[model samples]
Target: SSSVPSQKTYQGSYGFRLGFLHSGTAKSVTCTYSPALNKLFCQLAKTCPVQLWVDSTPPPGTRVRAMAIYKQSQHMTEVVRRCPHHERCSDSDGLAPPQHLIRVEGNLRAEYLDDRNTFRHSVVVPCEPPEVGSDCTTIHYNYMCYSSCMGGMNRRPILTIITLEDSSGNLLGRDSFEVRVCACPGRDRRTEEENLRKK
Candidate 1:
């Protein structure tokens, strides 16, 4: 067994997925886990039909909230930064450092459809302009990367969470995933760090 499920079902038992949407058609996208960061990771395209997919249905009166999280580059040195209470947090470990989850600015919108089971969730850079960066001059389309790292970022190593709730604003369930949204995924960064260590 591996840290990441090798089955490639992408669909989770909690029913969250990284997916693509174009011209009204939607499809699942592949993602892998990074034990370094210990979360699912996906490399996404800019201004594309990238999407978040949740189960087709939920309890009546249920609502959803999706938020992006990242660290402050200035605080990157705090290898064991304390976390806030009442929100999910990752503690410092040999595999990864502690995270102080700062919510990025932006709202993720859901495109609802009565005819289909899959809902289309959409959004872009959660940070302000100039904070987020990209490069499409050398492009790859119809596919995503696991080791690529040639772009920019507001803050490296960003995580996102989607929470499902009911009418009373009580938590029902939640799931979190990460996006590389930069030159590449964290795996490449870790490998380079290890190489430096062995030198």
Candidate 2:
């Protein structure tokens, strides 16, 4: 009875929540979740929030977060990011291997996320007096990610789709989309020497 439908934008939320809360609760932070690679971690076990930078201090939240791979077709819920054609592909198609996305970054800039091969430059969590709670620190904000697309072919398991908005903010429909398919570590095996020459 679950697999996305919280806003039917498909309760699909994954990675880089980019921690932004301008007021309250973490009771002193310490959050964790890591379904074997799809990760999420938070730390700061002693009050922290003297000042959260940018985007009106988390009043509208998550500006540029992206996680993708989603499509639909078997019985139909209609959501598409990619993967189609092959006579609309078959096998009762309905896959959500990894789908989630949050948008509205559009020129909203905030930086400090780099480790790209030891260019090493990641440090921005310092607050002792900017006023929003006066003095809070224990530092610990981590975010890890993995988003893949083009798991193309022999058909299925690669869900990743997030793009729907309506009611005058219009875009992407189908009662707020979500379908499934994503074990996308490149499926299609067989060749350990053809299974040791077929045993």
Candidate 3:
């Protein structure tokens, strides 16, 4: 007889940004995984655009890679309206077995600086897992972004994934995540006040 391991779902929370710091230094972010959704949430500052990046420290025993970004605007909207921070589930219904992969999601908004005459940019980057197995591993991910740059309200949503292979170009493991971009309404208030003060 063969033994089967029960399928399990783990919940985790990862921070994309801390606060509004005007510096080019690399700020530290954290990700916490919990079997329960009680501790899975990401928080950002009120008025700041940030470029987010994630990579497993010490690396997973097997290679750990970021497959892609999956943005859930509708879901995020619900969260914002009702539950600001709620547990998000992954779409791993049709994935392979013995897989060691993780997914993360969040959003970033672009900020405009009058003093520097520049606009802060936000981007979603993917990390790849190490290759050790002979089988090929591919993951699909997606994300969405909402901004108020360029005179008009902008909403751009995207979905993409990364492929991982062994030395022989064989698939190993695959995973995916998402990030939803949102503009801080409070920031708009601050900007309005600043303009008025200048006058």
Which candidate achieves the best lDDT against the true structure? 1
Q: Top TM-score: which candidate number?
A: 1
Which tens-of-lDDT digit does each residue in 37-139 have in candidate 1? 4344334422222344455544556554443434445523322112232113333222211222222122332221111222212121211111135211111
For model 3, the stretches where C-alpha displacement exceeds 4 angstroms are 1-154, 160-162, 168-170, 183-199
User: Candidate 2 at 108: error in angstroms?
Assistant: 21
Off by over 4 Å in 1: 1-30, 46-58, 72-152, 183-199
Ranking by TM-score: 1, 3, 2
lDDT of 3 by residue, 63-170 (tens): 222322223444221111111121122332232111112222332221111112221111222323325761222222222113211211223322222222233323
Cα misplacement distance, residue 181 of candidate 1 (Å): 1.8
Error of 3 at 51 (Å): 18
Better by lDDT, candidate 3 or 1: 1
* 42: Cα error in model 1, Å: 2.6
